Design a protein around this ligand. Structure first.
Ligand SMILES: [Zn+2]
Ligand SMILES: [Zn+2]
Ligand SMILES: [Zn+2]
Length: 89
DNA sequence: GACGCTATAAAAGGAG
DNA sequence: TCCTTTTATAGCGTCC
């Protein structure tokens, strides 16, 4: 089976191949946020979101644009940005 | 128009 | 496999 682990909430019913990913997903239903920022004590649903968040404190911007070389704290922001060099206003 | 930021999904790494 | 960590995608909010 491609994606064995199914979500128990009948409304959702999203599928995952890895069990961790299902557990992480069920958390959006339970509202459990096990990842805590040790600076402001805010809780996050994922390690990824906590890590992206820690950068807002440290000011680190590890994502650079290939075209203009401008820096960004997150991958999405960087990727979405790159698309402005391909069009006008 | 742009982008800072959180959410969420999906994949991958590593150890036993 | 279980658990950790990384990579990809979707909006919201706000200032310009
Ligand atoms: Zn669900
Ligand atoms: Zn914090
Ligand atoms: Zn650029």
């Amino acid at each position: 089976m491609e994606r064995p682990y199914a979500c128990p909430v009948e409304s959702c019913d999203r599928r995952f191949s890895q069990k961790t990913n299902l557990d992480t997903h069920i958390r959006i239903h339970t509202g459990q946020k096990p990842f805590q920022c040790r600076i402001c004590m805010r809780n996050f649903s994922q390690q990824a979101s906590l890590n992206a968040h820690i950068r807002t404190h440290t000011g680190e911007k590890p994502f650079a644009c290939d075209i203009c070389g401008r820096k960004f704290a997150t991958l999405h922001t960087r990727t979405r940005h790159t698309k402005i060099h391909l069009r006008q206003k």
